[PDB]
Structure formats: structure tokens, C-alpha cells
Design an enzyme around this catalytic site. Structure first.
Site, short mmCIF file in Angstrom:
data_model
loop_
_atom_site.label_atom_id
_atom_site.label_comp_id
_atom_site.label_asym_id
_atom_site.label_seq_id
_atom_site.Cartn_x
_atom_site.Cartn_y
_atom_site.Cartn_z
N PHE A 187 0.66 -1.29 0.15
CA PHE A 187 -0.06 -0.12 0.09
C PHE A 187 0.93 1.24 -0.02
O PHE A 187 1.93 1.14 0.71
CB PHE A 187 -0.99 0.12 1.39
CG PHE A 187 -1.87 -1.18 1.35
CD1 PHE A 187 -1.26 -2.25 1.90
CD2 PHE A 187 -3.11 -1.11 0.84
CE1 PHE A 187 -1.89 -3.47 2.01
CE2 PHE A 187 -3.83 -2.39 1.05
CZ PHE A 187 -3.35 -3.44 1.58
N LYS A 188 0.40 2.21 -0.62
CA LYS A 188 0.95 3.63 -0.53
C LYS A 188 -0.03 4.62 -0.45
O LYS A 188 -0.87 5.19 -0.98
CB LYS A 188 1.42 3.92 -2.19
CG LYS A 188 2.42 5.05 -2.33
CD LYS A 188 3.00 5.50 -3.45
CE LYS A 188 1.91 5.92 -4.44
NZ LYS A 188 2.57 6.42 -5.92
#
EC number: 4.2.1.43
Lengths: 304, 304
Positions: B165-166
């Protein structure tokens, strides 16, 4: 005076049940829309689910639809793209294939990447430099970009091909009135959109064209014709009769409205959008058809 | 534990002065970024000006960069697209070309088109079904879409390839902490972005990776390294020294920051974006370089 006026509905993109392009249905949708009395057609717009297709599919759709229309009615090819050079190239190709006009959203991306007025002006100026057909500037919320009436009027006065406008932001009637006052005869096409939800007020403001959904242009055109004839009370009566359909499309069924109607009438094979866009909820679709049946639109009685 | 950690800067797209793709400079930019010590690279993201290129260019760039990287460091290929089938197809292709991971924004379009959580889940589930490499879900403002920590954690627990995840939305630190608590070990890659402006607080929150600008990954990586070593005070000192540069990139020079640096250093031939994106203002650029020179980054002394 203007080269184009009247109703120019957005042609929806027809997909097979599994998502593939369905060109046979695509041609039938086009034919029904022309039979519905459309003065012209707009392709690859947001109501055409253009955001769900690839560049290759876009070109296939452009060539296919233009060839099928066979010059019967003018076609507006949506060529929106952030890149000026890409928009210019797509607009040139549209012209080469017979497009009468191109429509373009101001350059932007998502809800974070915007461009200063100075560069937006250059964007349109350069697209204009590359082509010989008119440009329709789209003023809609999807771009998250503010295109004031003065700026729009300035582009119309200073950029050769900028002559048409699709005003779809809140308070379109007031904006259209301002655009016309500031742009004068440089404003060749002051048009509205949003499926014709604010049509009557927009006509009062000076709108000469409307880009609507393609499910029932036969029900909307008479409104513009009555207004054109100077019969405002008749326009209201026709506007009143169809407003519930227009309203349901605008706030309930949305994009899929035209395809749902075309599917019901046997115009197209599938009304499905491409995943992940959601299918119409059952009651929403049922209510749509119930209203349409009270209006007896051509889409439900197209024996072809 | 995780397959990937560290710094994964975004590779900018290099254009010739006239807008055409400059593949020679593109290759040099990749080599510099690797020499800078990058743990991996992410291509075709928004900081790569992906919104300004075509599908064809996208594929040319993917092949060109992957082949030039020659398996030296893992490459994250951004495959975002509204259409589930299109994203899945581009993700499968990226994998086949050598991608180690794919990054995808949740499906959306402009600032008007959104998708219900239910369909977003299916979007990612189907992209996952099509590939055998991890998926990095991007939680950024550009999508204007809400991806709650609980929902993100749910996807990680229920969708095989969703593991990275960013988190780039405001208050990323708090969200990262919540994502990790709800997702547990399913959260293989809790990473941040925004050129590392909130890196220190995010590392405190449990971030194990950072996707930054590609201009000075050599200046940022030591911060993550110091943290991994448990030397929080040392991490602060390193963070403090480079924060002005990070801050200038985040609020002043933006996307073009990396390219302005590479150009000044002779890494690439042109730092220009594609029109209509505006060039950096003279003062903004001068200030950028002045700050950079105070830090002696590799980009200004890359003898190649």
C-alpha cells in the site's frame, strides 16, 4: 448563422455482455439515434464510457461510427486528453475521417492535476492550429477546472476554431447569458448539457443547442424547436411532459439510462457497462422504464 | 519478512525538447537512480507524467525500462485504469515483461466518476486473479476516492495479491498505524509517498517503505536505514538535513523536481514536461538547485 444548432446527443458505447466492444449494436444505436431526429451526434464523451476503453478501441469506435453515419448528420468527436500534442493528433485524425467538430475538456487529470489559464489557452490555441474544423470547449465539473465566462469568451475571440461551448457547470443559464454577452458573435455555439435537466432555463438564457443522453432525443428536440418558433408556452408544455424522464436520467439512472432503454427496445444486445461501473439497481431500472412507457419514445418502438 | 522494503523512487518520463519520448535519457535516468542506491523503481506513476502519454508510449516505456534495468532491482509498474479488464490485461503484460509488482489507483475518472466499495473490491480481486505478482494499492488524493483503513486491511486479508500500500492521503501516519493494526501480517508493505514529506512520522507509525521523487533517493534512503537500525535520533538528524529539499519538491517544484535535477547534472537531455504542463518558474528552479547544492546529492556529480 451558426453552422450547427439543435440536439446533439451523446452516443453510448455498446459492449457485449462480457465487456468486448459490440460493433453491430453500436451501429444500430447510431441508426436509431439518427432516426430519432438528432441534428447531430457526439461520440466518445463521458456518457460514452470513454474512460473505460483503450486508445485502440477509441480509434476503432471513431472510424466505425463515422463510416456508419455516412455523412447523414454531423458528428462531434470528443478528443479530450491532457497532452496538447495528443489531443491535436486525435483531433486531426477525427477531421480526416470526416468529423464536423471535436469536443475537448480543458487539460487536467483526476482531482489533483490542474493547469493555469495561460497554458489552457495555449492548449486550445495549438489544437486549433492543427485543424480546420471547430472546437467545442467543455465546461464541466468532471475537470475540476474553472473556465470563467470571460476566459471562454476570450478564447472564442482569439482562437480561430474555438466557437462552440458545452456549459455543464452549476448555474449554466447565468453563465451562458454572460458568455454570450462577453463573446458576441464569436460565440457560435452556446450549448448546454446534463441530459437537458436545465434546458428551458438555458434556452431563456440564449442556448441554441443541447447535448443530451441518446435514449430519447426525439422527446427533447421538440422543446428546442418550439422555443425556436417563439412558442415559449408550448416549449414549457413539452418540457413538462418529459422532465420526469430527464430528471430520472440525471439523478437516478445516469450514464446507463440510454443503454437500458435501447436494450429494452431491442436496439442493442447488451446494456451492461464495463466492470467496475455498477449495474443499474433493479427498482431504479424499473422506474426508468415505467416513466419511459408513459412517454412513448421511439427507442421502445423502433422496428429495425 | 516482506519481499520488498526500502526506497522505491518514481522514475520520471524523459521527453525531448519537443515532447517526443527521449529513450536515451530515459535509460540514463534509470541508471542514475539505481546508482543512487534505490531499492527498487516505480514507473508510469503520476510523477512519471503518465497522464501525458499514450497507451503505445506506455508499452514502449515499460519494455525499455524493464529491459534496461536488466533485473538489477525490482520494478513496480503502475497499471492504473478505470476498466477492470484493461487494468488486469496491462498488469498481466507487465508481469510477463518482468515486473516484480504492479501499482494501481482505485478505479475512478476525473472528479465526478466514483465506484462503490463493493465494485472496487471486485476490481482488485479480479486483477489479482489475473496475475501472480503482488499488487500495491494506492491511496492518494488524485482518485478522490475513500479507501478506509478497514477496507484496505480487508482487501489484504481477502485478496491474494493485495499486499502493498502507498498511503498518500493527509494524516498518513495515523492511517498506516490503523492499517497495520487491522491488517496484521497481511500488510506486507505499509509504505508512504508524497516525496517523503512526512517520512519520520510515518516510520514511527510502522512504514517499511517509501515511494519518493527520483531526484535524490540517495539522500532519503539513509533515513529509512537509520530507522531500521533502531537509531531514531540519527534518523532525525538525516531527516532534518534533507527536509528543506523534500519540502521544496513537495510544495514548490513538484513533479518536475527530479527532472530539473537530472538535467542540471547532465543525466538527461531535457527537463521539460509535455505541454500544457507548465515549466518551473525561474525562481522556483533556482531555489531548488541552491538547496540541492547544500546537500551534495549524487544527481549533481554523476560522472557518466
Amino acid at each position: 448563422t451558426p453552422r450547427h444548432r439543435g440536439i446533439f446527443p451523446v452516443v453510448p458505447t455498446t459492449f457485449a455482455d462480457t465487456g468486448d466492444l459490440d460493433l453491430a449494436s453500436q451501429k444500430r444505436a447510431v441508426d436509431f439515434m439518427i432516426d430519432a431526429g438528432s441534428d447531430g451526434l457526439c461520440i466518445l464523451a463521458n456518457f460514452s464510457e470513454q474512460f473505460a476503453i483503450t486508445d485502440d478501441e477509441r480509434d476503432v469506435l471513431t472510424r466505425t461510427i463515422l463510416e456508419h453515419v455516412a455523412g447523414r448528420v454531423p458528428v462531434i468527436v470528443t478528443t479530450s486528453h491532457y497532452s496538447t500534442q495528443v489531443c491535436a493528433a486525435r483531433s486531426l485524425r477525427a477531421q480526416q475521417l470526416g468529423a464536423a467538430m471535436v469536443m475537448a475538456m480543458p487539460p487536467y487529470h483526476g482531482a489533483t492535476f490542474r493547469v493555469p489559464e495561460a497554458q489552457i489557452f495555449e492548449f486550445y490555441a495549438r489544437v486549433s492550429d492543427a485543424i480546420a474544423i471547430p472546437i467545442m470547449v467543455q465546461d464541466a465539473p468532471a475537470s475540476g477546472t474553472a473556465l470563467s465566462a470571460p476566459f471562454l469568451a476570450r478564447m472564442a475571440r482569439e482562437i480561430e476554431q474555438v466557437a462552440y461551448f458545452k456549459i455543464e457547470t452549476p448555474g449554466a443559464a447565468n453563465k451562458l447569458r454572460e458568455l454570450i454577452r462577453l463573446g458576441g458573435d464569436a460565440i457560435e455555439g452556446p450549448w448546454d448539457g446534463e441530459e437537458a435537466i436545465t434546458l428551458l432555463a438555458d434556452l431563456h438564457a440564449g442556448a441554441t443547442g443541447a447535448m443530451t443522453g441518446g435514449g430519447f432525443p426525439d422527446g427533447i428536440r421538440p422543446i428546442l424547436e418550439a422555443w425556436r418558433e417563439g412558442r415559449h408556452d408550448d416549449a414549457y408544455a413539452r418540457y413538462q411532459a418529459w422532465l420526469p424522464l430527464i430528471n430520472h436520467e440525471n439523478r437516478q439512472s445516469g450514464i446507463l439510462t440510454a443503454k437500458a432503454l435501447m436494450r429494452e427496445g431491442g436496439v442493442i444486445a447488451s446494456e451492461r457497462p464495463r466492470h467496475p461501473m455498477p449495474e443499474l439497481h433493479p427498482d431504479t431500472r424499473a422506474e426508468l422504464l415505467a416513466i419511459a412507457r408513459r412517454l412513448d419514445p421511439l427507442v421502445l418502438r423502433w422496428a429495425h
